[PDB]
Design an enzyme around this catalytic site. Sequence first.
Site, PDB file in Angstrom:
ATOM      1  N   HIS A 158      67.017  44.557  34.471  1.00  0.00           N
ATOM      2  CA  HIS A 158      68.304  44.910  33.975  1.00  0.00           C
ATOM      3  C   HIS A 158      69.321  44.451  35.007  1.00  0.00           C
ATOM      4  O   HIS A 158      70.493  44.395  34.668  1.00  0.00           O
ATOM      5  CB  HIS A 158      68.331  46.413  33.628  1.00  0.00           C
ATOM      6  CG  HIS A 158      69.652  46.897  33.098  1.00  0.00           C
ATOM      7  ND1 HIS A 158      70.615  47.428  33.902  1.00  0.00           N
ATOM      8  CD2 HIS A 158      70.267  46.993  31.997  1.00  0.00           C
ATOM      9  CE1 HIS A 158      71.780  47.810  33.155  1.00  0.00           C
ATOM     10  NE2 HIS A 158      71.419  47.435  31.796  1.00  0.00           N
ATOM     11  N   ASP A 190      84.057  45.464  31.256  1.00  0.00           N
ATOM     12  CA  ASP A 190      82.978  45.504  32.259  1.00  0.00           C
ATOM     13  C   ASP A 190      83.464  44.846  33.528  1.00  0.00           C
ATOM     14  O   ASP A 190      84.611  44.395  33.616  1.00  0.00           O
ATOM     15  CB  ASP A 190      81.779  44.760  31.674  1.00  0.00           C
ATOM     16  CG  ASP A 190      80.429  45.173  32.214  1.00  0.00           C
ATOM     17  OD1 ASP A 190      80.273  45.748  33.322  1.00  0.00           O
ATOM     18  OD2 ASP A 190      79.426  44.873  31.521  1.00  0.00           O
ATOM     19  N   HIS A 425      81.270  49.182  29.687  1.00  0.00           N
ATOM     20  CA  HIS A 425      79.917  48.923  30.158  1.00  0.00           C
ATOM     21  C   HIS A 425      79.849  48.846  31.691  1.00  0.00           C
ATOM     22  O   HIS A 425      78.817  48.494  32.230  1.00  0.00           O
ATOM     23  CB  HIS A 425      79.451  47.606  29.523  1.00  0.00           C
ATOM     24  CG  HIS A 425      77.977  47.332  29.609  1.00  0.00           C
ATOM     25  ND1 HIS A 425      77.450  46.454  30.528  1.00  0.00           N
ATOM     26  CD2 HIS A 425      76.929  47.773  28.871  1.00  0.00           C
ATOM     27  CE1 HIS A 425      76.133  46.374  30.368  1.00  0.00           C
ATOM     28  NE2 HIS A 425      75.793  47.157  29.358  1.00  0.00           N
ATOM     29  N   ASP A 450      67.043  47.346  38.699  1.00  0.00           N
ATOM     30  CA  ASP A 450      68.492  47.170  38.839  1.00  0.00           C
ATOM     31  C   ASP A 450      68.881  46.834  40.285  1.00  0.00           C
ATOM     32  O   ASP A 450      68.062  46.893  41.200  1.00  0.00           O
ATOM     33  CB  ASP A 450      69.194  48.436  38.330  1.00  0.00           C
ATOM     34  CG  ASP A 450      69.368  48.427  36.859  1.00  0.00           C
ATOM     35  OD1 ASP A 450      69.970  47.430  36.350  1.00  0.00           O
ATOM     36  OD2 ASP A 450      69.047  49.403  36.154  1.00  0.00           O
TER      37      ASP A 450
END
EC number: 3.1.4.4
Length: 490
Positions: A158, A190, A425, A450
């Site tokens: 991710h 974002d 986001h 992540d």
Amino acid sequence: SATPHLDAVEQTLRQVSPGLEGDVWERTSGNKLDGSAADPSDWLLQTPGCWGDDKCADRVGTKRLLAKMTENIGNATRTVDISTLAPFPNGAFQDAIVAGLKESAAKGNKLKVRILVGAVIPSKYRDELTAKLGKAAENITLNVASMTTSKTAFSWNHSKILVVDGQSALTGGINSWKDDYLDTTHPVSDVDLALTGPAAGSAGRYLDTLWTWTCQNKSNIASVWFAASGNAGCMPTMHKDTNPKASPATGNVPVIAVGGLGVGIKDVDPKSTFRPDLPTASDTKCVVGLHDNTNADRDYDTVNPEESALRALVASAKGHIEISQQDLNATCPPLPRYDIRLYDALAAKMAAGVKVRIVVSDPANRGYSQIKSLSEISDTLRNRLANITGGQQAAKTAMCSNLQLATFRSSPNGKWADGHPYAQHHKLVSVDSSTFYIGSKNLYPSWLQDFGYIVESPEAAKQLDAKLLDPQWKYSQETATVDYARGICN
Ligand SMILES: *[PH-](=O)([O-])[O-]
């Protein structure tokens, strides 16, 4: 100390994940936020960057994001290292990558390139890219892969990273999805950051960690789909093998790089002697059968230092905390609804008079939302406050005196002019107008690979306030259910 917030976060990470220092987290000095001379805040790669305008006509953010991707890649002399969430980059994101690779090839460089996504696709993307590069493809050794590290724990990459030569890095929340971000009159809001220096090396060592696993598992179809140019093999350690172990210094900015290995790569850090007090339950686990890695798995924490790092960042705040996320809560099942220790840390701060702002994506998006109402956040904060303020009445008072809680807007209109709700986001936390996280790690429970950066630089934090957080609050505050600054308390 000049860096009280990083010092605290670093001390936590060395207890949690000592064996992963260097590779999955690392503190470095000598970095630079990579803005232009004309607009020094434009290291802050927000998109769309069309504040005040419900038609989003002048997308200065998007334009800078795409230009900076192309510029960085076009300056490559050795390596380009990209990770993202599937689908593979398309539209103008892909155009930016192709343009930059063609530029580097025309400057005479021979490049190694890795593109990793979390999930016939990889081979098809490789071939599309090779076709689009034309003669520039002769200068390029390419690896493309899609991977899943655990089906049962829903774990795959991710992280969203673009590292060039181990020298420059872009990372943040932006997936390279044209329909959601670009070719739309309701673009997703974002943010990424751009830096250079030793911290870019940290990202390259993180990607080596992921590719080392990926190459080891490349013959297992359920786990990895791999494709390479010509006769090229998988490159598990491209960064180590090609770039200097310590990247050159470019500035004076201190940074902690931090990520996580999710589930299915490594089960535990065997060097860790971390032994956490694990919060007393709560109503987070909606079902008794679910294994909760976020709240009830010590070993998981040791291979996911980013969770602890973000909680430590919150704990380091002396004055105020701003959080901008898609969500604080996850959909249960299969995840627990919330990170108990995170909400406890926020509660502890509010009980101490530290202000907390949380802006999340409009539930009308539920999908870029996982809650029906902001009450799902405020009820939870209130309940955790009750444990430390003596009851429900004192919890409500503490919360209403110290919380701003709202859904996101970027103009005066409640929705975009095309009628669609605003979706956000970001994975952003800022404290004390000093120290901030920008990266891919959501604060809602998630068990993915992540990565992100925690930067301690009041100058940069002030730029983040002026360019993103202040405009966000200007328009978002109209939806607030709690706002201490205006005495609002629903
Ligand atoms: P992410 O791209 O799911 O937050």
